Design a binder for this molecule. Structure first.
Ligand SMILES: Cc1cc2nc3c(=O)[nH]c(=O)nc-3n(C[C@H](O)[C@H](O)[C@H](O)COP(=O)(O)OP(=O)(O)OC[C@H]3O[C@@H](n4cnc5c(N)ncnc54)[C@H](O)[C@@H]3O)c2cc1C
Ligand SMILES: O=C(Cc1nn[nH]n1)c1ccc(C2CCCCC2)cc1
Ligand SMILES: [Cl-]
Ligand SMILES: [Cl-]
Length: 451
């Protein structure tokens, strides 16, 4: 039996443990945190994630999809809150079967843990990886108090998150070629209670966005009708724009409140504990981390956030993580040896991780400044016409990322061609009446191969 050691019982680590264990691998999975299935007196505060086709299909192959969806809230469309008009629901894709699911992270983790153990994996909690010795094939683990334990390993999978100890240990034996790109936006999570969302008739079965240019709020629903609101806002004000809103200017809850009443006046009444949340929840940091290589020979490979931290603006990090786990399990299961498997995995997935990293950055502009401009409206309306006349050629980029399993690089490449097609068609035209539709359709057929 082939043996594998996995660091991190997060989303990618637990899924890959399930897929390998049920193929007969001996799987040991080590996790720094305690087991979240052991109930304690602490008050767990878990956020929700948007689960889409790529994540859903990976769970479907694992036999876990139905269990996960039982606990998920359907989001049928995007509820855009633009000042001056009523909130406007934009359906996802073309028909009612194209939805995103809002799923609690801790519930998903528990389901995945149960699934890995049922497939035969052994999960060891309260053991955090501290270092690796690649030449002696040993690693050092330790509990919180610092007491250390050594284990031999044969194949090591670093599924240990954006601050991966495995990636750090790989920097001893190979150049990963890391480039960290910081992001000027931080984020803060605020809460809407069920009473407040019910009192203000906030739609539960939708994803809600409050665009506002260089800042914005997003809200995902929970099963109990509460919402978690995420404010994205610059850490610091730029020197050129010294009065522009930023976190540094929101020192306490009362400034926060005046900000929301002025700039989000229909959302402010719903955030009852805006003051308290603002001061006791930490401001989070966003960053994109790109690696030229993900593995060391046949000994160790990264996946998930350990491999490609990305900004959350597409809701694709977990979706990408689950899709990585599927691909890593398939390559390991079928390769001549572990070395060939890890090379072929990195070669397949690294271009795709780059593509989704780039699309997540760009999607910030789409969500916060594009959805409210006159020019983008005309293009989106021409885009839906094109999807109807050429359905296998013109597939909107958001739809290819979110509702298909087209490799992310091909989605990006086709999206760039569509974007420039729509951009030139609508330029110097104010209405849809002055646009030659068959001209645009002819460029779809000349430039977009059918799927
Ligand atoms: C605010 C926010 C919102 C997001 N929303 C979405 C969304 O809506 N949709 C989406 O698809 N993605 C979303 N993401 C991204 C998503 O959360 C991650 O991409 C996903 O969790 C990656 O899964 P993973 O298994 O790689 O890592 P994680 O889920 O982070 O798992 C890492 C695991 O490794 C463990 N670990 C860490 N260090 C060690 C160590 N030294 N030793 C042992 N164990 C260790 C951790 O305890 C944890 O269990 C969001 C991210 C953020 C920050
Ligand atoms: O699906 C998307 C992107 C989209 N654009 N237009 N429709 N939705 C999407 C984008 C972001 C999120 C998360 C990001 C972290 C904070 C919670 C919300 C979820 C999902
Ligand atoms: Cl959309
Ligand atoms: Cl994400």
């Amino acid at each position: 039996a082939r043996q594998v050691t996995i660091i991190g019982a997060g989303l990618a680590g637990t899924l890959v443990a399930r897929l390998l264990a049920r193929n007969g691998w001996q799987v040991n999975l080590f996790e720094r945190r305690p087991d979240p299935r052991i109930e304690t007196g602490a008050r767990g505060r878990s956020i929700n994630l948007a689960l889409a086709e790529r994540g859903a299909h990976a769970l479907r192959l694992a036999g876990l999809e139905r269990e996960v969806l039982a606990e998920a809230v359907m989001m049928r469309g995007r509820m855009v809150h633009v000042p001056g008009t009523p909130p406007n629901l934009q359906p996802y894709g073309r028909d009612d079967s194209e939805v995103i699911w809002s799923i609690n992270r801790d519930r998903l983790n528990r389901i995945l843990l149960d699934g890995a153990e049922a497939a035969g994996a052994s999960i060891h909690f309260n053991l955090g990886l501290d270092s690796v010795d690649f030449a002696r094939q040993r690693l050092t683990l330790s509990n919180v108090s610092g007491e250390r334990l050594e284990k031999r390993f044969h194949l090591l999978i670093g599924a240990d998150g954006c601050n991966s100890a495995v990636r750090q240990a790989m920097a001893s034996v190979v150049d990963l070629g890391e480039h960290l790109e910081t992001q000027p936006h931080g984020y803060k999570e605020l809460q809407i209670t069920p009473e407040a969302s019910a009192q203000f008739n906030l739609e539960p079965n939708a994803l809600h966005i409050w665009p506002h240019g260089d800042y914005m709020c997003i809200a995902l629903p929970n099963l109990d009708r509460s919402f978690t609101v995420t404010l994205f806002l610059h850490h610091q004000s730029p020197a050129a724009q010294p009065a522009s809103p930023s976190f540094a200017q929101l020192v306490d809850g009362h400034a926060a409140r005046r900000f929301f009443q002025r700039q989000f006046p229909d959302l402010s009444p719903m955030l009852d504990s805006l003051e308290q949340d603002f001061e006791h929840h930490p401001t989070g940091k966003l960053a994109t981390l790109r690696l030229t290589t993900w593995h060391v020979g046949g000994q160790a490979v990264l996946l998930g956030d350990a491999a490609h931290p990305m900004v959350p603006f597409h809701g694709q990090g977990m979706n990408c993580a689950l899709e990585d786990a599927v691909a890593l399990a398939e390559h390991l299961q079928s390769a001549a040896d572990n070395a060939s498997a890890l090379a072929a995995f990195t070669a397949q997935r690294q271009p795709d991780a780059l593509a989704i990293q780039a699309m997540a950055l760009e999607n910030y502009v789409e969500m916060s400044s594009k959805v409210a401009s006159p020019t983008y409206l005309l293009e989106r309306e021409l885009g839906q016409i094109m999807a109807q006349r050429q359905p296998t050629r013109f597939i909107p980029r958001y739809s290819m990322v979110t509702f298909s399993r087209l490799p992310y690089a091909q989605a990006m490449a086709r999206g760039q061609i569509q974007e420039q097609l729509l951009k030139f068609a609508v330029a110097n035209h104010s209405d849809l009446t002055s646009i030659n539709l068959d001209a645009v359709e002819h460029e779809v057929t000349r430039c977009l191969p059918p799927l």
